[PDB]
Design a protein around this ligand. Structure first.
Ligand SMILES: [Mg+2]
Ligand SMILES: [Mg+2]
Ligand SMILES: [Mg+2]
Lengths: 51, 56, 109, 199, 236
RNA sequence: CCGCGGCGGUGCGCCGCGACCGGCUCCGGGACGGCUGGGAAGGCCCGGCGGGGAAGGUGGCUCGGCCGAGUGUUACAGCCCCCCCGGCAGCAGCACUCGCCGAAUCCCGGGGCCGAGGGAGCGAGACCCGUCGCCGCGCUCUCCCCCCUCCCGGCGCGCCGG
RNA sequence: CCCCGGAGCCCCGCGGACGCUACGCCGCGACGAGUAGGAGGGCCGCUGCGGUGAGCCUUGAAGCCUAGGGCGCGGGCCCGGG
RNA sequence: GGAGCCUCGGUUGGCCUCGGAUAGCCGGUCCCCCGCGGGGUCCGGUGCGGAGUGCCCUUCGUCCUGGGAAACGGGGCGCGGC
């Protein structure tokens, strides 16, 4: 068998450890969530600067 | 001492070493841990049944 | 109607001091002198273009005396904007200090 | 396609280093006004250093032994020869590109000639340090033609001063010409300073 | 035949879960309680005396070779070119300008029209200006200049596709041996449909290009590297 | 013979592309943790409390046109600085890159390079072939609705019905 | 709730390779300096004998020579022409 | 002017002050001295050098016709003199 590297090859990671799927589903969403919230702070800071 | 570098590995270090370069000793043949069927077959008599268990 | 290739000199082979590794040319591309200025040129087609006694064929052309050895700039070689190449055959050594043409045409631009 | 480098104000080995690599990469170079090359370290220092080199001779037959060239051009050639693989074919080919002159003769006396600022004395030396003109050095070790090389260069500088005066005269008329014409080159001259010249 | 009830988050990661999907797809309520010899398989025909005849579709062969190669190994993810996904440098947008680097139309400047099915570019340096017709090119042998014409509302013919811009001639046998056979034929003739297509397209572009001052003259000109100017330094 | 139909091996010679995987080397983005629950900073200013350099000051002298410039002395604050009490949201290892250590507290996208190396179909009336494990999903055998609209159909480019 | 001379097959215990010179064939790991010295294998090479090739040979053997074509890691070998 | 072996490298040009560096470059002299220039003083500009090699010059499709701005410039390996 060829060793596909788990850390690059998503489905190999999942084969060896299926809980990866969730862990990576979280920490896309989590990071997006927080990225949105940073824009919202930045918009409030611009509004406070305009005021 | 003057023949080695060593110290206290991170969590991530234990993962990266095990996933990228994790090879079983399975009937004395270095064999790459491609599935848990390998780990289990050998270490399952200890409650260790997957890569994750191994890391823990 | 003019020149569609950037000039470069064949520096010589990739080599240690006392072991030259002939399978890898080094290429001093004209006008670039920083392992910085040289991400343009990575993966570009390059021609050692030379002529010889007997005639040859020529793609979309009548038989000629010019011949070429094609190659490809692979990676940047040391700080001062030299570049590594690798050619479909190794370069002659006759070639040292002569032109090789670095094309534009595997472009990412 | 050819370097011409005014060897004045440069440093002997410092210039030679740079010239060697140019020459090895197939660049044809010319090095001019070699007597004007100047060598770090106080004069006397370097005279002895040369005089030592003179002492080096093949005892049994000097006629074979290390040929000590006097002319500053040949000296500078010697030091560039010391930084090439000149026993090889490629090394010998390399030197054949290099072309050195005491003073500045007729092809290159009407060519603009560069200056290697990485070999230049004003840059590479502390101002309180001492140095030697390779001319003086050459002269005292037996170079025959200092004075001749001086008398020919006074001609050249006089001849050149004239050229510059005429050049200046054109430049001046050209500055006047633009001012004469600057309503019928106005919407050209505008576009050459949107993309950022003329400023 | 509903679409994908979870969207894509990342290639290979759906937005939702197993559990959200069970509720979305509604596996609750969608529970499916469900508890040769004589007769010849596939031959059969007609025929006269004696009776009817049983033929055999796909009849076993009349020659076996002495040795032959033995299968392969399935191999997972190896699509044919047609089923491939097609990329495009973000630089190259419709109605942008290219410098075609390789062919006979070499260094010539051009307008980009569309990416065909293939993944090739469709191109026109309006035949009129440049002497470059409706023509395919590759992303990879083209420099995407930072100069655009606004080409939005030009109806490029639907019928012009990869399949049309495709070389044509030459079949197998004929007289063959001697000093003849398809060394002649000689010329690719332009055809009239091709000329009509060009005429139609160029007119929509050609006004649009002109609106930009000097652009036609730029599109006449040819690109080439002079002294002191290095690709890596300059921009296009 | 024309089909280049289906499968199998191939290319005369020189070429190029494409996508998939392996191993690399880079690039660009973002999201987090911990600390003297970071240190400094910024911003708003208020009330005090001292100390220092040394000042819109004064003074000896000098240099220029009462003013500007250059030294010198005692030193308050009307140039600042520093300590001490008390209090505000703007901070955030901060693109005002002033000084860290990291990642189950971590992800995404992109470029250059080298390589593909194996071959679980040799049945006589019924495949010359899939595929194992993993991902999920996606779909359906459940009904709903909404939108956009590509093909086609209808009505007035617009609207309505795969 | 039935029989493979017919379930149609990813498993088939009814019969079994394209494969099986079993001194054969195939798969997984690991490793590979070497004098003196030791051992193994040489479808490497020379000359003669018993067998054996219904071998080859005046329609040209051996040897010799060859900027001809190849094979083998190599000892060597095979073909073309003379 | 025609063919025809061979040896190759090349793939816009740059037709120039002198020099300085704890300094330079350009102007213009109203004014003075020397042989249109040279030297001086004075004044006015530039100086991380735009009268910049971080530069300049040159253009890179061919033709047609029928307007504008620019317009006497280019050529005939055009021809004789200084
Ligand atoms: Mg050994
Ligand atoms: Mg031995
Ligand atoms: Mg050529």
């Amino acid at each position: 068998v060829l060793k596909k590297n788990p850390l690059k090859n998503l489905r190999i990671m999942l084969k060896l450890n299926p809980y990866a799927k969730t862990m990576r589903r979280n920490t896309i969403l989590r990071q997006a969530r927080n990225h949105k919230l940073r824009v919202e702070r930045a918009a409030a800071a611009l509004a406070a600067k305009k005021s | 001492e003057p023949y080695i570098a060593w110290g206290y590995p991170n969590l991530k270090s234990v993962n990266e070493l095990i996933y990228k370069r994790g090879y079983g000793k399975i009937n004395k043949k270095r064999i790459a841990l491609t599935d848990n069927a390998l780990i289990a077959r050998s270490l399952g008599k200890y409650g260790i049944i997957c890569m994750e268990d191994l890391i823990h | 109607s003019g020149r569609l290739w950037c000039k470069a000199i064949f520096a010589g082979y990739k080599r240690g001091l006392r072991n030259q590794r002939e399978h890898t040319a080094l290429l001093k591309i004209e006008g670039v002198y920083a392992r910085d200025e040289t991400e343009f040129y990575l993966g570009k087609r390059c021609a050692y273009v030379y002529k010889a006694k007997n005639n040859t064929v020529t793609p979309g052309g009548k038989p000629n005396k010019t011949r070429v050895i094609w190659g490809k700039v692979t990676r940047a070689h040391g700080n001062s904007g030299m570049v590594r190449a690798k050619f479909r055959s190794n370069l002659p050594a006759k070639a040292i200090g002569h032109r090789i043409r670095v094309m534009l045409y595997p472009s990412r631009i | 396609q050819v370097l011409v480098l005014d060897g004045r104000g440069h440093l002997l080995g410092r210039l030679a280093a740079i010239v060697a690599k140019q020459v090895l990469l197939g660049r044809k170079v010319v090095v001019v006004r070699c007597e004007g090359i100047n060598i770090s370290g106080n004069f006397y220092r370097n005279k002895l250093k040369y005089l030592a080199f003179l002492r080096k001779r093949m005892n049994t037959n000097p006629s074979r032994g290390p040929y000590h060239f006097r002319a500053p051009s040949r000296i500078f050639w010697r030091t560039v020869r010391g930084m090439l693989p000149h026993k090889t074919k490629r090394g010998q080919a390399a030197l054949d590109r290099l072309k050195v002159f005491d003073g500045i003769p007729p092809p290159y006396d009407k060519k603009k000639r560069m200056v290697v600022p990485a070999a230049l004395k004003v840059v590479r030396l502390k101002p309180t340090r001492k140095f030697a003109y390779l001319g003086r050095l050459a002269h005292e070790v037996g170079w025959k033609y200092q004075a001749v090389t001086a008398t020919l260069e006074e001609k050249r500088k006089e001849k050149a001063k004239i050229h510059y005066r005429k050049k200046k005269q054109l430049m001046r008329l050209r500055k006047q010409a633009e001012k004469n014409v600057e309503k019928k080159i106005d919407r050209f001259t505008e576009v050459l300073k949107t993309h950022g010249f003329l400023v | 035949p509903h679409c994908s009830r979870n969207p894509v988050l990342v290639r290979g990661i759906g937005r939702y879960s197993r559990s959200a999907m069970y509720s979305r797809k509604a596996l609750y309520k969608r529970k499916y309680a469900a508890p040769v010899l004589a007769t010849v398989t596939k031959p059969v025909g007609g025929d006269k005396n004696g009776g009817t005849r049983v033929v055999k579709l796909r009849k076993m062969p009349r020659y076996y070779p002495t040795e032959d190669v033995p299968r392969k190994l399935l191999s997972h993810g190896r699509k044919p070119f047609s089923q491939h996904v097609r990329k495009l440098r973000a630089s190259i947008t419709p109605g942008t300008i290219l410098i075609i680097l390789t062919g006979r139309h070499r260094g010539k400047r051009v307008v980009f029209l569309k990416q065909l099915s293939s993944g090739l570019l469709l191109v026109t340096g309006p035949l009129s200006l440049n002497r470059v017709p409706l023509r395919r090119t590759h992303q990879k042998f083209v420099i995407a200049t930072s100069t655009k014409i606004d080409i939005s509302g030009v109806k490029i013919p639907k019928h012009l596709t990869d399949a049309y811009f495709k070389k044509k001639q030459l079949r197998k046998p004929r007289h063959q041996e001697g000093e003849i056979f398809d060394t002649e034929k000689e010329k690719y003739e332009i055809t009239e449909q091709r000329k009509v297509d060009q005429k139609a397209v160029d007119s929509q572009i050609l006004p649009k290009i002109k609106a930009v001052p000097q652009l036609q003259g730029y599109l006449r000109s040819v690109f080439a590297l002079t002294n002191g100017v290095y690709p890596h330094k300059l921009v296009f």
